[model samples]
Target: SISKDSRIAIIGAGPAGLAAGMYLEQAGFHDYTILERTDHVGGKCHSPNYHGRRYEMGAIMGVPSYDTIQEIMDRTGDKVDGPKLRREFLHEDGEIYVPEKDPVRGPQVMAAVQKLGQLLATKYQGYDANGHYNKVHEDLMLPFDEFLALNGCEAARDLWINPFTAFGYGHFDNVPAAYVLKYLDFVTMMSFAKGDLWTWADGTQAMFEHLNATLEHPAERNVDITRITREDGKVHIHTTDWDRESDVLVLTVPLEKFLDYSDADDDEREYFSKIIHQQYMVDACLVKEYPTISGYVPDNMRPERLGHVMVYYHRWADDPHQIITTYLLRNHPDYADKTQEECRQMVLDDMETFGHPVEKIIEEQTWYYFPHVSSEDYKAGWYEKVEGMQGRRNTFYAGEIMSFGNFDEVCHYSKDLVTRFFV
Candidate 1:
């Protein structure tokens, strides 16, 4: 049981950190505080309102697997609606195709995909128990493209590229086979069949706001974390302005951010250094033209083609500005960097290709999102090692990188940490 006198300090007010505090409140532990680097509650889930309408500029939609958020909504007393995701594919030849609605081949491909996911889940689930289900088999460690080809799933590979790219994993082949399969089984397959996508009707930020508002102890924003260490059987958190001591420390920041340490011990620092981060950027633009379309483009496009891996559009009814979100793989060879104005121009230029010219720039945002890791490194017992690090000097880790990057999975991870350690 958690001691009523235990002082807990949570770093970062992102989904993971916020969820950790929420669970602590539910479990009747209120002797805790959350520290956030930004002024707002949501981290990547930041949403901005332009011209009387709100748009998701950071982390956007999710699927039915968001059980934690769903439960929170149920308890929070404010009912919200979800989105019905309709997507299109833009081919190299400038053709737009709807895969899910394709009368002939959509069902067959989906059936095969579902079948493959079920088979993998049966074989991979609970292998070593303790919920370490997705162990790295030799076949699972193969690059996604090679794995699909080896399994004779080539015909369906192209169908998944746009989805995976839009999901922020970049190219499908860059990740391991297990990641793709586990995502299908856990997140996408059911929702894909039902043609469903879920997000807060107000915006993604509302959920985070509710989470923060409901916390027994409010989160402190714009607080910079200077150092985290254990001394005298207590966790010491140093900040730019003040220092606090706590019985336990929960770190919810990304590995890249956390590894830039000041007071961390050698063991803690060396353990996190092995993890790698991928280059990612989400550029949000509010324009006048909002098409009922979204899709992926080739990595190698002409300079004038505005080479974005994936593009999505969101336009609310009677809203003056439409939201156009684009994902860029910064490390891609053909990728280019320019001023925000120039980047907006590229988006307008690309819009013209689809016959919708951007009217005016309302608001723009750029975010560094998501950590990219390889299956080889992950399978080499990275998670287990990180798990071992927990409870050492009263420090525990929680984040998408520590678990997986999905919203629900990360929330579940936070709750699990509290239950396993604090409770």
Candidate 2:
């Protein structure tokens, strides 16, 4: 077991790193430091102030099933103070498509969703764990699109259409069923299908900022990590700001980028090289008009419509002057990659097509989101292979690459890591 008093260095001050710090402190380990390369603390729970309130450019809504997040809020005395958001679904051409109100399709979708939930419970027990360490059934190791068809659960796709794809996991053709099940796990799916969600009022980033500040060893911001090496059972982290050595290194950064900033070994390089990520983009701006309430455009969610507006977020429905954030993906499994300039123009054009021309674009964010492996790699025991290396070189892993890329999943992974290793 790792020593509690061992000096620890955690990379990437995102939800994973910050939560690791909190869990370590909770376990009575105080010699840990979190390093963030950006000027801000929250890596992707980025919520910048707009006028008085804040708007989310990264993670927005979460569910009550988020136990770790709930625990943090309870310990920190925070509440779900964000807007009680409602939805107004629309097509790419601007006509509203409220499936919930459709008496015919609505019932069918719910029935299938319920059946899928039961199917997962009995047929795929222990599928939605905090991390994908426990190997699931072999059938689940297929592409999500095929997994649904094989199990005759294809009709339930509509239930998770918006929350799964439009929210930017990816089109079903490429993502592994493991990722699909975990992200839209039975509880999460029901939450969305039932329209019960939660958001942070000050924005998601505020939660992390509060968590960071509450920590005894808060994250050192504006840190430019140059390279890292593990030698003599110690982690030597070299950065532009300073050089430091620690007994243990916890890396929350994307595993695919490990070699870029660290002296990775054969397993780190081979295992990490197999991972892939989503180029999910967000554009926050002032539009002349839209459906008012936030919405998903299912018509443009396919790979062919890559870089088109899949979701248009209206954070403050009461305020007409507030920013409208638009979302799209530049990289699709089957489609050719598009340039940022091209994708930006496409979003602007899509806004116009939806009868909402942008008056001013406040900012555009392209996130390297939802890093995971292919079904083939996953089936070949990728998680097991990587998990075996947890403390191989005095280095540990947490964050998006280990779990499903979301706020709660990363929190769960970090907590589980501390539970397994630190205490």
Q: What's the TM-score of each model vs. the native?
A: 0.86, 0.97
Q: List where candidate 1 sits over 4 angstroms from the true fold.
A: 1-4, 82-84, 100-108, 126-138, 286-289, 296-309, 317-320, 332-346
lDDT of 1 by residue, 45-124 (tens): 77787556567766667666667778767756545474445566665444676666777778777766765566566865
What's model 1's lDDT at 153?
Answer: 65
Q: Tell me how many clashing residue pairs each candidate has.
A: 0, 0
Which of the numbered candidates is closest to the native, going by highest lDDT?
A: 2
> In model 2, which residue pairs have backbone atoms overlapping below 3 Å?
none
Estimate, for each residue in 284-338, the C-alpha lDDT of model 2 and write its tens digit.
Answer: 9888874467778888887878888898887888888888999988887677887
